[PDB]
Amino acid sequence: APVKLYMVEVIDKKEIAANEITHYYQVTFRLTTDDRKDLVLNIDKSSYQNIEPEMKGRLFMQGSRFVQFETDVPID
Amino acid sequence: PVKLYMVEVIDKKEIAANERRSVTGPEITHYYQVTFRLTTDDRKDLVLNIDKSSYQNIEPEMKGRLFMQGSRFVQFETDV
Amino acid sequence: APVKLYMVEVIDKKEIAANERRSRTGPEITHYYQVTFRLTTDDRKDLVLNIDKSSYQNIEPEMKGRLFMQGSRFVQFETDVP
Amino acid sequence: APVKLYMVEVIDKKEIAANERRTGPEITHYYQVTFRLTTDDRKDLVLNIDKSSYQNIEPEMKGRLFMQGSRFVQFETDVP
């Protein structure tokens, strides 16, 4: 599959320590377009910390896998 | 056994959620939930994950009969 | 984890039966008994807590009383004596 | 479309603390304020907005509401 772009807004963010066994960094990205859709994705620790609720940016997915999130920072 | 409910469709959303880890995709489950609200006296809301098919023929504001078997969605016939 | 008081008024009440998504058994579904409390003071604040079934059954809209909460968790609602 | 502008008056304001369904509990704070398009038109606009703006908005305040699609942006009230 190819890397697809999704215009979205950050609604959730939380760590899940599902059982010792696994730890998870999940964030809920809700589609910003008309098509009502939320993407509850498993993402990396690092990317997780730089993401904050209410951020609106571009979500890059490789099918069902999180590739990157680029917020629309305040400037210009 | 299957009960019937006079309900109205309020919300409706799709939810693609990654599950347990392990390829370029980590095992996901696509959900199609719709919020049904009772028309009767009591205030009850049924937030059910239903089939893609039904989901597409369901729109907010629709009123009708909801058929649940236990706490699982069976059918929704809009009275229109 | 102290327990504060909130002079309130019962505005809403609704049961929420929700199908849960695959967990961390089968397809479990959770019940939620939520009631909306509005501060009778002037703080312009509404509490929309999920409380146990038994309490929900004894709380009707338009009642006024003391609301006890431990942090953000509902503890009890005492309806102003007659 | 880009940020739109509407002449408006602040009808109400209220804070909503609500328990999320779904480690710990889970609280979501909403800072919703009700506006009224005074120029022409319909019913009132209920919108949750950032904690920052909320605190500066008081009922009866008259000003301009800047939105985007249907999401708050800023509320510029005329001088006092």
DSSP helix/strand/coil, D68: coil
Residues C52, C56, C57, CA angle at the centre, nearest 5°?
Answer: 120
- Least Cα distance to D9 among D54, D65, D48 occurs for D65
Rg (alpha carbons) of chain C, rounded to whole number: 15
CB contact under 8 A, C71 and D14: no
Q: Does domain A1-76 have CATH number 2.40.50.660?
A: yes
CB contact under 8 A, A62 and B17: no
CB contact under 8 A, C45 and D16: yes
Q: Cα separation of C74 and C51, whole Å?
A: 6
Which residue of chain D has the CA closest to C45?
Answer: D15
Q: Which two tokens stand for residue A46?
A: 């690092």
Give me the sign of the Cα torsion angle A51, A55, A61, A65: positive
- Least Cα distance to B16 among B27, B5, B3, B1 occurs for B27
Residues contacting residue B10 through CB under 8 Å, at least 6 positions apart: B35, B36, B37, B45, B60
Chain C positions touching D21 (Cβ under 8 A) are 16, 18, 30, 32, 50
Residue D69 backbone zone (phi > 0: left; psi -120 to 50: alpha; other: beta):
left
In total, chain A counts a number of residues equal to 76
Interface of A with C (CB under 8 A): 16, 18-19
Q: Does domain B1-80 have CATH number 3.40.50.300?
A: no
Residues contacting residue C37 through CB under 8 Å, at least 6 positions apart: C6, C8, C9, C10, C11, C46, C47, C48, C49, C67, C77
Task: Work out the end-to-end distance of chain B between its first and last CA atoms, rounded to an integer number of angstroms.
Answer: 26
Interface of B with C (CB under 8 A): 15, 17, 19, 29, 31, 33, 42-49, 71-73
Q: Per residue in A28-49, is it b (16+ CB within 10 Å) or e — as a string?
A: bbbbbeeeebbbbbbbeeeebe
Best of A40, A43, A59, A67 to disrupt the B interface by mutation (most B CBs within 10 Å)? Answer: A40
- For chain B, the residues before each gap (C–N > 2.5 Å) are 22
Experimental technique behind these coordinates: X-ray
Q: Which fold has domain C1-82?
A: OB fold (Dihydrolipoamide Acetyltransferase, E2P) (2.40.50)
